[PDB]
Ligand binder design. Sequence first.
Ligand SMILES: CSC[C@H]1O[C@@H](n2cnc3c(N)ncnc32)[C@H](O)[C@@H]1O
Ligand SMILES: CSC[C@H]1O[C@@H](n2cnc3c(N)ncnc32)[C@H](O)[C@@H]1O
Ligand SMILES: NCCCCN(CCCN)CCCN
Ligand SMILES: NCCCCN(CCCN)CCCN
Ligand SMILES: [Fe+3]
Lengths: 345, 345
Amino acid sequence: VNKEALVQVAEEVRRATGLPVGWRDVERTLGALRATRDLWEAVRLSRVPLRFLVPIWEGLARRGLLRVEEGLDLLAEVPAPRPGEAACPACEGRGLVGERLPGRAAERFLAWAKERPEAIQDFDQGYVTPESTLARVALAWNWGDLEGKEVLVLGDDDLTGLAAALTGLPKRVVVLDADPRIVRFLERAAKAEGLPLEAHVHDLREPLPEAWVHAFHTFFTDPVEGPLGLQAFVGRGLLALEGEGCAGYVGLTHVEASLAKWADFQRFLLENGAVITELRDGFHVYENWGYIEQMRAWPWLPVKRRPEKPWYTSALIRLELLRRADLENARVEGDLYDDEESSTT
Amino acid sequence: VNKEALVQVAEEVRRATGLPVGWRDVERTLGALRATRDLWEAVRLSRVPLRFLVPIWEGLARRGLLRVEEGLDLLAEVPAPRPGEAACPACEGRGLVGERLPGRAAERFLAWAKERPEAIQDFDQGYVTPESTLARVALAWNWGDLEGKEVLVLGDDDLTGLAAALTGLPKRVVVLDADPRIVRFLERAAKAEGLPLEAHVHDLREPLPEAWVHAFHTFFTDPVEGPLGLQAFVGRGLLALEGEGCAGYVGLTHVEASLAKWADFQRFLLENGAVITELRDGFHVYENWGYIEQMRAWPWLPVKRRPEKPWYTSALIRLELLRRADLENARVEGDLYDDEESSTT
Ligand SMILES: CSC[C@H]1O[C@@H](n2cnc3c(N)ncnc32)[C@H](O)[C@@H]1O
Ligand SMILES: CSC[C@H]1O[C@@H](n2cnc3c(N)ncnc32)[C@H](O)[C@@H]1O
Ligand SMILES: NCCCCN(CCCN)CCCN
Ligand SMILES: NCCCCN(CCCN)CCCN
Ligand SMILES: [Fe+3]
């Protein structure tokens, strides 16, 4: 197997699906398979969308390069790099450790996370590990985006708002979520701990209310990944920021977003006056959600076994505004949970 | 002292200098000074250009907010966050570690580093610590940008090329540098260790030779940071990549580049076919160079004592091409080593 084989597998998939699948996506697919035969692990190692993975694995099987039988087994020596093991074990490759946060935030957060609302399918929910929440908050601590600042959290299954509020740092934390279970849990924690934390039921398919426009120094979001998802979560965040000097924290996956779409996201940020100052790939590790068998991709999977360990991960982005973001504050139209590269909804 | 003072301090500096100095840079300046009396540590904690910090420190002193003597001491309570301390100590916040590299590369690189050429001012040199180099290469290993790949290094006081060769992963490594000392050291190492590693004297102000155009899968550079430096090094590197699916690794400082120049750099990348997949800020720690008292900024400093520990740092950026970059291969006109934001030449 040689380099042109990778090119032809991609073009074939590009022809069937209309999606931006290139040869390096095929290389990555094969590279992961050098290290694992487990489907979920292959996904984690690959950094390719699950929507691309399925037809690539099938194209590869058609050519006799891959055996699909209770696992994904390579049949040939391949022209693809093996995954390297360079990640720092002490911080799981993050570079940041939440244990270091003040106000004993890390230990107090673990107590709350034990009673957290379970992830549900209606809102594309699936929460990150506690260490991932605490480290995302620690990035914001390190960049001076918590202390004395007004913090907005757009969707909060991860409980970032709680973690941010437990540090003692923020002036206040406001959390928006469509799910009353998350709002109520946050309001129970706020009252029990004495935290300057409020939470409100709001569906981000509808415009951001005027109280929250240009009213915050810092936002966090781990959003749905459409262009619709970027209108519903990130565009709203940008509009919520007062302006120059305000910062945003954004989750970004490979599983549901290609590099062509990472580039569309980055171009959206740069054209609306922001700049990226951190992009830590693989920063968030997700806890397995209960509804995996009900997602769109499940019937497509070549091997179907419930995962037993984490496999879904995302990058953490920090952006900062160089000027005020005057974006439209419009309704989302179209199905937020049906992006063409989505798979876990 | 309210936020409007922060804005006035920035507006004065901006008006005096013509440079993009904003309120958040003044907040960052002050935030750092909450945490240290030491000028070099204040630079490291600030994330502000030294060309900015000098006049901000002077503007603060003029308003009776900062005492400047054998240390920098704040004279009032200030609305500025204290920088957080959540970096993982194990990997110095990078998330990556060199020790696991293949070929026993870490251990072998350390021994060659002991005899490295010392940094000279003629070429704006200043090498990162050995672990910074190794971690930079390890990021490339984790992203599959070394194994069976053709690697170009554009400038190499850091000896990234030797470190990458020592893994035994690349197909080959080509190093270009204007300094014959760097070239000759690499040749000797290549010969002694039997590595597929070659080095050539080349001045990046001149066109990339045709034999290196669109010839590589991976490049590394830690470049001079003007518009011009970014054209001589990064624009060359992009031209050197074959195209879609190829990777670049770029060092980018706060010390000599503002957030506005970071945003100009990011837009350059995105409009030339690239996408950022990693941006780890503060990844590289730099060893203190000999000619510090002959650098441009030295007479500007409000206190003048040799640094006893590291203070200059830079981000590590990973870019990937979504398509071929067809940039011009023209001669770079102007003064490479005299960018408006430069301070360490
Ligand atoms: C997208 S999953 C991250 C979070 O955003 C929330 N979320 C998902 N969809 C919406 C929506 N349309 N409006 C508001 N919050 C949402 C979820 O309930 C979860 O806490
Ligand atoms: C910017 S310093 C990093 C490296 O680039 C090299 N360098 C600096 N200027 C040039 C140039 N004009 N052409 C090639 N290499 C350069 C230095 O010798 C060093 O090893
Ligand atoms: N469907 C469960 C996985 C959700 C991942 N995130 C969506 C990103 C892809 N569009 C939301 C996670 C919130 N913590
Ligand atoms: N003048 C000494 C400091 C120069 C910094 N540059 C050194 C590059 C080689 N390691 C890098 C600036 C970041 N692009
Ligand atoms: Fe670490």
